[PDB]
Amino acid sequence: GDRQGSKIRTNIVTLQQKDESTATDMRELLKEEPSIDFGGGNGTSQFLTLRGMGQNSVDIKVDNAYSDSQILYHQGRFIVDPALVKVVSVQKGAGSASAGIGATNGAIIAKTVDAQDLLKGLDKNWGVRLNSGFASNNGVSYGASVFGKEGNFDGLFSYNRNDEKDYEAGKGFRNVNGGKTVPYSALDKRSYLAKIGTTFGDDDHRIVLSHMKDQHRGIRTVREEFTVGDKSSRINIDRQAPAYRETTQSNTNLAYTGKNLGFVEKLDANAYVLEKERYSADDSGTGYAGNVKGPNHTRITTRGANFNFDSRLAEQTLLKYGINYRHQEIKPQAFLNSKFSEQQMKDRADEDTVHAYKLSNPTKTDTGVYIEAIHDIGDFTLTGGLRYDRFKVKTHDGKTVSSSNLNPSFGVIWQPHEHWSFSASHNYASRSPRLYDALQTHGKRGIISIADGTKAERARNTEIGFNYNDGTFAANGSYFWQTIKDALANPQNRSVAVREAVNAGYIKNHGYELGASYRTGGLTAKVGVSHSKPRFYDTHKDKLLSANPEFGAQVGRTWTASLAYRFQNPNLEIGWRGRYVQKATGSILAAGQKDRKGNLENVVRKGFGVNDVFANWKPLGKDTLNVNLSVNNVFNKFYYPHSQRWTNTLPGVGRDVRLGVNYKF
Amino acid sequence: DRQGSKIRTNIVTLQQKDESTATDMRELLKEEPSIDFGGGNGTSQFLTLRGMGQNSVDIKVDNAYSDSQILYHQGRFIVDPALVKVVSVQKGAGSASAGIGATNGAIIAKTVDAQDLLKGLDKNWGVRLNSGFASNNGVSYGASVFGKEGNFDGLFSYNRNDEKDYEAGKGFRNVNGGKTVPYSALDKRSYLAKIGTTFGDDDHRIVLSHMKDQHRGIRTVREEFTVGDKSSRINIDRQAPAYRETTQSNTNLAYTGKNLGFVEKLDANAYVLEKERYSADDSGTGYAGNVKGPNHTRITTRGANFNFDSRLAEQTLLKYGINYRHQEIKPQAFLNSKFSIPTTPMEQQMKDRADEDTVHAYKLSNPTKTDTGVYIEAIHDIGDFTLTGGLRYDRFKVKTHDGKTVSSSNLNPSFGVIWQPHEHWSFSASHNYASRSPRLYDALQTHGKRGIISIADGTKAERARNTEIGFNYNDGTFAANGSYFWQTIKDALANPQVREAVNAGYIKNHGYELGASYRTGGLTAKVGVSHSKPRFYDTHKDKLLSANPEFGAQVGRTWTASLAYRFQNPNLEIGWRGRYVQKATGSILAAGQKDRKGNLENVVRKGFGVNDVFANWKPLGKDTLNVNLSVNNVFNKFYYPHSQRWTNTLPGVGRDVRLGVNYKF
Amino acid sequence: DRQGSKIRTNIVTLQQKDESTATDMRELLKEEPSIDFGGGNGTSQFLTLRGMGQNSVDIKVDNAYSDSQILYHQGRFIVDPALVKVVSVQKGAGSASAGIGATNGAIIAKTVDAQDLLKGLDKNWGVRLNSGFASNNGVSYGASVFGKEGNFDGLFSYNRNDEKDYEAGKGFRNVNGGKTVPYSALDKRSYLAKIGTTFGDDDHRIVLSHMKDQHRGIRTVREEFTVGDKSSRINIDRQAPAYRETTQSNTNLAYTGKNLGFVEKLDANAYVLEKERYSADDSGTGYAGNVKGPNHTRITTRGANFNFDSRLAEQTLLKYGINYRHQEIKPQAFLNSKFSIPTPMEQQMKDRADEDTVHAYKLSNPTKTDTGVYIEAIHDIGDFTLTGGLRYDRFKVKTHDGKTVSSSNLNPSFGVIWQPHEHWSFSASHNYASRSPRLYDALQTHGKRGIISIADGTKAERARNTEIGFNYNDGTFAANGSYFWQTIKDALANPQAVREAVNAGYIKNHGYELGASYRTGGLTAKVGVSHSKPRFYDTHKDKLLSANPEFGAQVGRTWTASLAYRFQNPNLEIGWRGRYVQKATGSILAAGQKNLENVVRKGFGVNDVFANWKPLGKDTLNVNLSVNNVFNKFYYPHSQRWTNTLPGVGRDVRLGVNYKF
Ligand SMILES: CCCCCCCCOCCOCCOCCOCCOCCO
Ligand SMILES: CCCCCCCCOCCOCCOCCOCCOCCO
């Protein structure tokens, strides 16, 4: 099983569990997980943090494809729709050698659903699955899926839609027209999956071809992390200029797995193309896009491939080795550059420089080779590995800078008794600079480059853990220490017309997680707690590190608990679930954060509890029909989650009563 | 049905509807002489019952209904008959169990169910496909899947009707000199999703339902008009056509329990009904505040109804229950601050300048209206008399967009007698009181850019006093019915008095309806005639009632007739149908209506007659396959219907040849 | 087929199309040397046949076709092959039964039917799913449901093809220095709805059918160009991209009765064809009158055809029938009143009197009515088949000023086929046909730029097409050849404040086509070449004929070939396909196009490799892999303007799957 205490949590959500839930986003789906925290709002209003660390350092992997770029820092990076997914797992902090590219701070890892998963409940080779959803606060959802198998072939198509209105925050929230809803938080969210696959050669070989699309549309504000405030605020209707928007994530993926190949005992490979888009119907009121009148379209394309081989050197020792490749390219619609604008000469001088550049699409190439030995001796499992990682960054001025890193990793698990493991690991990993914001790449605000020696961030993550499980009771614990050198955030002047990415500091993180469960005769009891302390230490004279929630947030210590009971007759689980986040204090920046004026901020944030009760009934006895009812945020709590800025941005959803149905025939 | 012609239950049956070629209520209910629809597609249409408009008459689907509107230049939304299984009608003030607002009657529809679709089939699941062509000018299709497992049942239906600009009858010429009515094309879609359980000896049922009904296309600001000459008020610039979606959605939870002791039967309903207007650009829409780019306007209607039947004795039933409805209108944004009165002269701009300040100073909230009623009704059979007594207590509460709140309440008695002396005869009389609360202002004007719309301090509900008599003859071959009615309605409200909603006068209506039918060996013959005379008497100094079609129309005496013959081999029915409306004369306003420049309008409306031939064949003898052929408006008559404005707005559909197949397996 | 190469029936089969990865006609018909398509996506494309453009060549689906256009800066709409079950081609002037306007030929397509989809299945209903992936750069999918109960049948197909800006071949650079062609992305959707009945000993059939084909995306004013440098006439401002939908719809009622006695066969068709352009904002569109906000422009085409075959004797068939078509263009609004000539004085005064006249016109939707009656006798004697025919064609044009002008024509046709041996045919035909004036551009009909009328005597174009051919086929080897000569009198192009459609010259064309094939046990080899020479000759003093690609292009001599092997086990065909077009020279204008242009168009080759696999052996599952333009060749095709408009798609790797159950 999982034996690194709490640092690798495999299959946190299973498809069969997910079908008993009423959630239609990751935020509600992973709320029992204390180290994970989502900001408020719909879609890409949301930021995610893991052990306090943001999506600058934590990735969401679906079918083993992931970008590390972003569209705009006033919104978070795209979070996949769980309707597509069959499993979610998590890996925290710096990973081992087989972990892939950029594993400094960890990842949400998801696999899309397959034909065999959907056929599960049925006694035949094809099937249909319908679902619908109703939410009082305030949405409607449905989907369908058709799937099957003939000879050595299988396939599926799933369409899902979730049409969500402006959500009502908890009690006491008032929106400036004096309503209870959060302006421009409506989103029409659609996804599809198309898969075809073949399994051949004694079932030891499989090729799967997959296309996924995940899309959000609606009238959204420039800056999705805020709504519209009072006309006297910086977040008023004019500055925030809502306009129709679509933001999309698409992935075509080819995947192969072979087993018992003689020359190797298992091989996994993946080649994909991931597209991230922003489309806006009018960008006149969008400063960041260069105020581009009418439709505007921004792309990020990610091409990747991974190969992974497992070779057995002896009954007790496995050798994993492989290679990762990823290329990312950002495409503005048009470069804007030529439009960039008593001793101002120095400025006309600057003006003439920007105009003089001829800009190209920025790219970034990451590649890595790795080996890992996993050796079992006595009731110890020892893991040794190494990665060699290089990147190359070509910014929009054509400037190219690369570097490379050698990253060792060591891990021990000890399992003395059959109910016990204990763990320790010491993992190094590196993470290449990120390209600037895709939406700002047109270069209208000046040129964004990279300094000559700039290098990758490099993490040294040490941690210990234990797992207990005796079949009734379970528990796990993790303590971790993280240092990351050469952190990069905002660019340095070389006057503010031309700037360069630079290493600018270091990062500390440390903390703990506990979890326990109790299982008997239909009763399922659970508790968990997590606290961590991300800190960003400026090292550069112009202090360029950032408290942008993308990097992290100092989240309150977080408790979660659940209590559920499953009746033998009728087949019905009812239960309660709560999440309590304590009061939090302090910026992620050790020197503190400022305020557009430049003034110290006394970052404080309130604790709050959210409580939910739910029910799953299975009127037919099988998992072919699920009727689910939930009432989330029972007490209609008014609150702001912690992973976002601390000023009063976007509250949690007020109370919400949901009825979902899925049905398989 | 024994109130002569005042309650017509099941005017349209599903099995009849499958033999028809109609795709809207207007064509479906054309044999009904008291019902009249204005010209044009979708919400261009106004409906009148006994000459009374959608201000006083509601369409109820699954016992959910709003009384609000989007904009007075269009009619209120008329459900797609593709969704429905039955249509019924109740005219004038209803009895106590009728629900909220029953002063003038209602079209009442129920959506289709699993058991209705399984009708023709000898199994527990099925599919239904349909297809339609219309020469003038459209194409339609749909599919439906439905079934039953254990105590469960469900269905999904999709229907689409893609209609082009229609050609009017002969001699119509459109201003480019074409024969089609500009911007009358609509792409009309509907869905139904339902899931239900029947349990407990078949005496209990819970059904959960979602319906969506949507029209899209390039439509004019003001759908009651097309585009006229560039010299008219209805020219291309003023009418500024643009893409639009207008939508009716309902999620509905319905419960019925039977044989529960003291309660012989219980019916209950809780629902959320959404009405929406979406426009892709509202720059040329004055009424929306000339809002540039996309614009959404919402009306949300939450309701619940509970209804109990208790049996006090074998001949007496007691009905009692409670109705609750909350309506809330949501503009996309209040506009308030941009209130502006042009100079254009005149030299009394003074007070203007003042009013401009008045208006910018408000803070506006979404208007709401809450209606609630408790009622009791006894139905007593003695000798060959059936007596009905009832009472309703109704209250409302109106919160306008300035936050002002005004309520009132009413106690509404109702008495009804049916006498059935012979088995072929009934005679009837009723004396029914009912009330109807003020309507909220137009949803699309709620933003307040044209000024503040409030409600005066003592304003109260309209109150109807409807007396009527009737008879029903039926001997198995020959049938007939007749109704005479008289209607007084006190405290009529129309245009506001910052302006406020006030009571401004009273309404009269009287008239009659006769019908008769003749059925014997294959032949079926029918006739019907109806005439009413709605009159609106001003009481206020500013004359404040309105000749808007919403309120009503003086419609010509209307005759309908049909003759059809069902052959036995093939199973084929061929028939003629005709509808003839005589010339009508006045305004609905007793003192006369005035034309923009304030002059009295000499309201005159031509008579016309429309003839239709149709055929229904059943190639297999069962009802599981219908092939329907029709030609409507055979003589390609050019005319204007009466329920709309009298100037020449939107003509009837010219001649139209239609083919429709439905098939169920 | 026995007219050498002039009539190619069933060039594309449904069964073949299912093994292909192509999602447009251009890639589907690339092995056809006489057909050439311009560069770009959707209506950026021009078609030529024997060097003749869409001004004279039609696309007929289910025997319905318009001859009107939206705007001359884009080509006429080309149907999506996802709808079709067959494509066929008829070149030059047709015989009498060919329909209206058959001066220069037509691509001919039939939409798919229930029986075609049921093909591989052993039951009365079925589903078909498909998906596509394209590296450069798109994704596609669709679904179809279909069946049969008693005497009746029906189908619904939906198809969608979401295409990104395409990357051109190597060395192309776009002005932001990318490799993609700006605004060449299109979201392309089609659906088909059909219901039919077959009755009366299977000798009678009625089919009702509705089809819609639609392209949407951000597109430029003038789709034949992208966006060039800000110093060019094709810069971002002039080209003002904006959201656009362009749509072809057809509702069709079709009847066929057989062996009805005297009448051996009857085919009839009555249909309504809609062509539509919708734009979200036309402010930067000069041609639409700079109409602010949404704008939509329509062309409606109502037609009917009736065709009878009567057998006068075992050896002689008589065909006769009648063709009717009405076309009406509808602007959103006439604009007429705002005509304005920019500000010498002596011309100014003329100018200001001009706008007064324009402003006095009250304008109506232009219409055109075409009708024709025909008879053809087909007579078989010895090993000769002789064909004699006659058409009488009239038209009536009502332009936007209400002016009406008609003419009529009597068009004879003669054809001989001689089949001396069973492996041999030889052919000749001498066919006259006429083609009525086309209405001005739909999108310009508003008349803001002035009034567009028709001169008093103007008449139809009239083609005299003579040609010879041969067909060899012995079961293993096959070859065909065609030579043709075309003269067309009274060509019309550009108008003579108030301007007038006129006859302004003539057109000549000649050339050849040759094909050859070789088929032996799984192996299939094919080659072809085609060369033609369209030439427009001004007759009018103001030189009025046009070099726009609508009318044609001097394409380079074109070679195609392919080589494929089909293995028995697995059921896999792999092959190669080439299309090389030689360098070209010259205008279609005999006197040259203008400031005189020396027209030169470079040659190029395109190579593709492809595989089709049937993992189940039935035709119910096809897995398709192709790589088109393997060597990533950078080029401009010839059926477009010679300047450097829109290049060939670069290299593109595709996988497509269809499955039937
Ligand atoms: C618009 C983007 C969203 C749609 C996603 C689909 C796009 C196309 O993707 C291609 C990937 O292939 C999926 C294969 O599905 C087609 C084959 O159907 C299944 C037949 O195989 C079952 C064999 O028993
Ligand atoms: C200018 C006039 C000529 C126009 C002709 C165009 C006609 C358009 O045809 C297609 C649309 O048809 C829709 C109406 O459907 C009529 C159905 O009649 C068919 C009878 O079939 C009997 C079944 O046994």
Residue numbers in the entry:
A (entry chain B): 60 to 400, 417 to 569, 572 to 742
B (entry chain C): 61 to 404, 415 to 567, 575 to 742
C (entry chain A): 61 to 403, 415 to 567, 574 to 671, 676 to 742
Provide the publication's sentences verbatim.
It is also known that other OMPs contribute to protective immunity, including the FrpB iron transporter (also known as FetA), which has been a component of several outer membrane vesicle-based vaccines. FrpB adopts a classical TBDT structure, with a 22-stranded β-barrel and a plug domain at the N-terminus, located within the lumen of the barrel. Sequence variation in FrpB from different meningococcal strains is mainly concentrated into a single region of approximately 40 residues, which is predicted to lie in an exposed location on the outer surface of the bacterium. In addition, we show that FrpB binds Fe3+ with high affinity, and that this binding site is separate from the antigenic region.
We initially solved the structure of the F3-3 variant by molecular replacement using the Shigella ShuA heme transporter structure as a search model. The FrpB F3-3 structure was solved by molecular replacement using a search model based on ShuA, a choice based on output from the program BALBES, although sequence identity, at about 21%, is still low. Analysis of the self-rotation function suggested that FrpB F3-3 forms a trimer in the asymmetric unit. The use of non-crystallographic symmetry averaging was valuable in obtaining electron density of sufficient quality to allow building of the loop regions of FrpB which differed from ShuA. This enabled the complete building of nine external loop regions outside the β-barrel, leaving two incomplete due to weak or absent electron density: these were part of the region of sequence hypervariability (residues 401 to 416) and external loop 8 (residues 568–573). Despite substantial sequence differences, the HR region adopts a similar structure in both the F3-3 and F5-1 variants, consisting of a short helix at the N-terminus, followed by an extended strand which packs against a C-terminal helix. One reason for the consistency of the structure of the antigenic region for both variants is the conservation of a group of residues at the base of the structure, which pack into a small hydrophobic core between the C-terminal helix and the loop, and consist of Phe399, Ile401, Val432, His433 and Y435 (F3-3 variant residue numbering). Some residues were missing from the electron density at the tip for both variants, and were omitted from the final structure.
